[PDB]
Design a protein around this nucleic acid. Structure first.
Ligand SMILES: Nc1nc2c(ncn2[C@@H]2O[C@H](COP(=O)(O)OP(=O)(O)O)[C@@H](O)[C@H]2O)c(=O)[nH]1
Lengths: 393, 205, 80, 85
RNA sequence: GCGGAUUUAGCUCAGUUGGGAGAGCGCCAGACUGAAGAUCUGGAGGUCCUGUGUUCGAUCCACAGAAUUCGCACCA
RNA sequence: UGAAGAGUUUGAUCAUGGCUCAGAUUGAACGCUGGCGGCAGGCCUAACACAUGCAAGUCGAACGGUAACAGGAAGAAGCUUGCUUCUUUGCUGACGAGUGGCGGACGGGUGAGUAAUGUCUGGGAAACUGCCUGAUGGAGGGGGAUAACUACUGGAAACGGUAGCUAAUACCGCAUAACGUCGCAAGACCAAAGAGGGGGACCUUCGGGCCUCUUGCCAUCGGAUGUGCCCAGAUGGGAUUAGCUAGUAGGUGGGGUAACGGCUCACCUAGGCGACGAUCCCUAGCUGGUCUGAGAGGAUGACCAGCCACACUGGAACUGAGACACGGUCCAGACUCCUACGGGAGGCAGCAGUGGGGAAUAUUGCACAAUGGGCGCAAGCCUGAUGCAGCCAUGCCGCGUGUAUGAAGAAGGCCUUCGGGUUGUAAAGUACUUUCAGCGGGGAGGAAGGGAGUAAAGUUAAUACCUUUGCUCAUUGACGUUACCCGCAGAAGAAGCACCGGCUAACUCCGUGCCAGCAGCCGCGGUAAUACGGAGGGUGCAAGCGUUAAUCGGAAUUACUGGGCGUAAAGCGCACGCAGGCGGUUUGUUAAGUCAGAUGUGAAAUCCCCGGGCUCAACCUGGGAACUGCAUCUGAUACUGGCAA
């Protein structure tokens, strides 16, 4: 039937972000076939007949790519992460999965909307490292352009809450490279070394209780129902009982496999993008936004007093003082649901730059635990950042 | 269900005690008994026909601890025998282990007699059981075990045993904590509050 | 085709076997030709749990039909 | 498609065109008797009766007349000549 | 996950569409009986789906959400 | 050991008659709730379409062989030297592939089709039957082959083509020829296969012949078993289905089947069938049985057993004792898939899974231990049959969630002339117990067999072999540390659900006010609701409770048991009369109807009668009776019918 893989080297999640234009789609493909020559090679391969239907259909740069590979340094799981406005909601979570992000920005253009946006989205609850790539340097011919553009790439990082203090900057033209323009392919080998130099490796705990967001839910062509995601913490040994704690549904299900892209694991550890297999429960019975967890985890809640920091309008944030009766949207992990502001007495009016404790009523319960980090967006931008101070029923 | 609730409160509107916390007490001793168990969720009046007709059906039913099903089933073996249907029924009802033990002085309360058999302290013959129903028959041997001639609950139920006549169709030995169920019950002398004709009309459709 | 065989009629985790002459084109629980025996493998003391006849295990084995290993070993131990 | 001995199909290709010829050799000889019956002859109907008499017999011993046909089919063709006689 | 489109008195629908909310039904009241009708006399009736942003002013414009519908997207 | 009614039409009443409820049930669903465990059941629909995996092989003891593995031998190396290493060789274990035999025609699943020479009951006559088994007899001697293999050569694969070689329990002669077959007769005609172990005397060109055993082979006549074929009778509904039929009905002669037959034909005759319901139309797999029910009856066909039918659609044939072979072939067709674009491939109503449908129905689990099945003379191998495990309150059953004692009776509620009443021994408080869960630790049993040795008292060689017999030895357990058993703390971890106007057991206080809402029926609510809502309380059931759907019961309300027709529902407007039903009275006869007896048979299962076995019970099970019935065999003659007078 199906194959085998195993956990060899540490599995680091990375991706390609940006705005529209840039390198993005071309760099993704580019990099892999270059690296594949130099750090891969196996004979009478899968690859060479089955070119290449599964990738166009199952993704579009939606959230993910199920590429696994080992580089001679570590293992890299690349997940291809939006940088289209149309997906802005998705990209918070994807970078939230990320451990470094390849920020391709075309050196020809400046900061564009998604280039500023992303770095600001990063620092708060997403990716902690940015690896800048000036692209289109076979269409910049002048080092004096290059120099200038770099200096404003610095300025984004340094006050959007990352060191601007040096980042390794890789400088080539994507579409040229892949075809056979050797001068840039050479540089592609230096990307496995900047995934060590600048990051270098995350420290995830695998000994917690279980926790996993939804990524994609399938009902496969001949096996049962599969849910995917990046194990956040804890572990999933093959054959198991689980509990999926969520929104208005709590599901009990039994786990009967945990492949990694039809190449079978006997675990699913943190930092790994994996597939999971279940008996029982069909795909429309699984809603998005639930977390797959142990039978042992906390139950869902609606109400909780919170501790939130009201950001200012300069780094993006509120600019009108605001009252009871607003509807801002809370991201906790995978997805979102609307919750209303209510202010325990001695407070009614809340200004830009406040700190505040306010008691929430979300329009659905969502599996809640004290301390749980969140962002609060309304109008599509962050109002404040906060934590669940004290859960209530 | 096995109940687990307020025994003596039942007595009030039972109009009889039928052995609810017997050991020191019975009717109107440290308890309020022979009233109505409601304020005016229920209070005394003239009574309906159908009241009686249900209550007595349950009278016979409750002093063995038998469920809904069981007692009907016993009726389906009685009205399968070509002997007396009335007799047969009350014959089958006394085959339950829980009833037999009480009438060998083991347990001061009907509920307690049945709560003995629960904890491992009972046995029948060399067989150990923890089952509150058994096939009890002529020349069986009701036997206490080792670590039940040790419990201080069992001894404390022999008190009341000196104060109840004990049946004549069983040997009873308390001195070595045995007794045999040597022969069949008599009900020539327990049908004294039981009208078989009533209940068997109702069971019939 | 017909053969001497054993044939469960026990429930779950009760091995009560019955020696039947039964078909191999139906089954051991399917179309019987006839009973011929009872057997306990557990050697129960119930009323007639062992029967094995003399007369049909000496007539349908005349025109041929083979028995089973427990049976083979039982012919001697009823000293038939 | 998968069968254990799906070769069985090919094996029968042999045994269905072997049978074939033996039977159709037997059917040409029955046509030769019938020739002579329309000639009124006992001298060419009987150069075709006793000459298929070991034929008919030895092919019942290949089983290719089959069953109670093969205790019948040395009398069925005997029948023929007797009308004419 | 991603795109459209749509919610105006309790009910049936207008209206502006940068500028300030009606008609019809139906209520609810005072009046006859206890209530209601026939009938009599009086009054009341919109977070304009919701939440923001702009302006002296948003139901209208712009943007986020919710619910309906209508198209899309998914085999580890 | 065997059946009860109530409410509901009316101002009141008695009938008539509908309506509703109380029962019992389910492959059930739904809503809420949910401690354990034993036994059973679990896609009813889209017979809709399916990824994948598995479910169908095994014999070397018929072969020709050696592809791999491992030794034996052999030369050799390293002299990594008496030990590592290399080549050779079918010698031996052992076995790739290929020829040969037998299974794959079973088992399994499904109920779509199907009112049926299909099923069921009961008979019958002109048949078959490999595997099975009895008896007697035989197995003689030749020939021609061709796979593999080999050398070439074509394609992306699937899948080929040349040319050469060879084996057999393969193929085809030939010989022999009855208790054979055919034939009145006289006569004529037909068969094969050996392979294995072992061995003393002899022989051999030393492979073997010889001998003895053993299994397998051939023939002929039987028996068994299992299976075709026929008949009669019973099998659903509709006359808003009345006319039907050309191999149609029959007769000859031909032909065909295993066998009987228009099965098929040539000819000949012109009949046949029909209202005791043809023809056609609707619907359905059928049965034992199942459910319910006092019974009769009705309803029904789930699991379990038997029968029949079907396997993408349609059609068709081959080999064979057996097939139109579910997982064989071919052809046509629509699907579906692949592709080197030339061409190919496929069919889950098999299991487990998939998607879609639907109210709803479970895991791509473990295993040959055991039972059975297949191949094989054996060993041995094979098994989605099976045994287990799993999932689901789908149901049946068992046990538990503590026992005792404890009052002015605790606050805390709730109701209350405000005296109290109620919750309530309930709690608190006191002792007493740890089942069962949880933890720690033992552990029966399901195993008989086969395998290594030894005894033979067979057979022959006296010995072998082979089979037989007991004994002797090491062991056969998948489930799973199984049943169970011991210890360990600590009430600990273990109650809910509906209802309380009348039928119907089970009410108060508030809020609401013919609104909100309730409601199986009869019916509720218009601001002092035992009927609505909440609270308090009370009631019935209890790891379940309640609701719905559905079938029978009550309903004797379709009535043979067991119903009406003056007016309640019903008597043609009235005569005549064909079919049909019906027949005064006496005698004789007959025995068809009928009565009696006898004999088969009436499957297993199921009921009952009696009676056991699991820790009980659930569940398991023995023997008897039942098996109401049917046909057959023989009598009886009163009645019924026929015949005669
Ligand atoms: N000349 C040039 N064109 C490029 C280069 N990189 C990408 N392109 C092209 O620009 C397109 C858009 O850029 P990309 O980052 O892939 O964008 P997104 O998918 O729209 O976010 C690519 O799909 C290419 O066709 C570059 O380095 N050089």
């Amino acid at each position: 039937s199906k194959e085998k893989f195993e956990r060899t080297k540490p599995h680091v999640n990375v991706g390609t972000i940006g705005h529209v234009d840039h390198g993005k789609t071309t760099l993704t493909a580019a990099i892999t076939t270059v690296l594949a020559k130099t750090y891969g090679g196996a004979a009478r391969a899968f690859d060479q007949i089955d070119n290449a239907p599964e990738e166009k259909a199952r993704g579009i740069t939606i959230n993910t790519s199920h590429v696994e590979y080992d580089t001679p340094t570590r293992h890299y799981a690349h997940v291809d992460c939006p940088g289209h406005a149309d997906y802005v909601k998705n990209m918070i979570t994807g970078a939230a999965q990320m451990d470094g992000a390849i920020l391709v920005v075309a050196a020809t253009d400046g900061p564009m909307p998604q280039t500023r946006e992303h770095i600001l989205l990063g620092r708060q609850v997403g990716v902690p490292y940015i690896i800048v790539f000036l692209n289109k340097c076979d269409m910049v011919d002048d080092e004096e352009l290059l120099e200038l553009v770099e200096m404003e790439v610095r300025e984004l990082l340094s006050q959007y809450d990352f060191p601007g203090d040096d980042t390794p900057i890789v400088r080539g033209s994507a579409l040229k490279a892949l075809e056979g323009d050797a001068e840039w392919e050479a540089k592609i080998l230096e990307l496995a070394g900047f995934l060590d130099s600048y990051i270098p490796e995350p420290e995830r705990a695998i000994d917690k209780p279980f926790l996993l967001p939804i990524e994609d839910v399938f009902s496969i062509s001949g096996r049962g129902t599969v849910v995917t995601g990046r194990v956040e913490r804890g572990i999933i040994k093959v054959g198991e009982e689980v509990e999926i704690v969520g929104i208005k549904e709590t599901q009990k299900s039994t786990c009967t496999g945990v492949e990694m892209f039809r190449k079978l694991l006997d675990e699913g550890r943190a930092g790994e993008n994996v597939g999971v297999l279940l008996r029982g429960i069909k795909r429309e019975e699984i809603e998005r936004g639930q977390v797959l967890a142990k039978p042992g985890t906390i139950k869902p809640h609606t109400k909780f007093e919170s501790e939130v920091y009201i950001l200012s309008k300069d780094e993006g944030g509120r600019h009108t003082p605001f009252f009871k009766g607003y509807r801002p949207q809370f991201y906790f992990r995978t997805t979102d649901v609307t919750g209303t502001i209510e202010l325990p007495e001695g407070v009614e009016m809340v200004m830009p730059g406040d700190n505040i404790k306010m008691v929430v009523t979300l329009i659905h319960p969502i599996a809640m635990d004290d301390g749980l980090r969140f962002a609060i967006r309304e109008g599509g931008r962050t109002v404040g950042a906060g934590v669940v101070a004290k859960v209530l029923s | 269900a096995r109940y687990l609730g307020p025994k003596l409160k039942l007595s009030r509107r039972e109009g009889t005690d039928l052995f609810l916390k017997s050991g020191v007490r019975a009717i109107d001793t440290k308890c309020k008994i022979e009233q109505a168990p409601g304020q005016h969720g229920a209070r005394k009046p003239r009574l309906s026909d159908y009241g009686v007709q249900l209550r007595e059906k349950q009278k016979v039913r409750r002093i063995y601890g038998v469920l809904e099903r069981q007692f009907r089933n016993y009726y389906k073996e009685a009205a399968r025998l070509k002997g007396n249907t009335g007799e047969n029924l009350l014959a089958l009802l006394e085959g339950r282990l829980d009833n037999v033990v009480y009438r060998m002085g083991f347990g001061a309360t009907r509920a307690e007699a049945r709560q003995l058999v629960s904890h491992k302290a009972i046995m029948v013959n060399g067989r150990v059981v923890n089952i509150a129903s058994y096939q009890v028959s002529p020349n069986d041997v009701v036997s206490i075990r080792e670590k039940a001639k040790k419990q201080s609950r069992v001894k404390a139920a022999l008190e009341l045993a000196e104060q109840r006549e004990k049946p004549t169709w069983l040997e009873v030995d308390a001195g070595k904590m045995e007794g045999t169920f040597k022969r069949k019950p008599e009900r020539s002398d327990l049908s004294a509050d039981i009208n078989e004709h009533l209940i068997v009309e109702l069971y019939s459709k | 085709m017909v053969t001497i065989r054993l044939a469960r009629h026990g429930a779950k985790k009760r091995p009560f076997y019955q020696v039947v002459v039964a078909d191999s084109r139906n089954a051991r629980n399917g179309r019987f030709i006839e009973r011929v025996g009872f057997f306990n493998p557990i050697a129960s003391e119930k009323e007639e749990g062992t029967r094995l006849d003399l007369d049909r295990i000496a007539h349908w084995v005349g025109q041929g039909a083979t028995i089973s290993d427990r049976v083979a070993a039982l012919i001697k131990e009823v000293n038939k | 498609n998968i069968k254990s001995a799906k070769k069985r199909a090919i094996q029968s290709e042999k045994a269905r065109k072997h049978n074939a010829s033996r039977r159709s050799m037997m059917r040409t000889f029955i046509k030769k008797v019938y020739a002579a019956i329309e000639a009124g002859d006992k001298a060419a109907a009987q150069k075709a009766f006793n000459e298929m008499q070991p034929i008919v017999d030895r092919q019942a011993a290949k089983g290719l007349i089959h069953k109670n046909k093969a205790a019948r089919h040395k009398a069925n063709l005997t029948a023929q000549i007797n009308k004419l006689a």
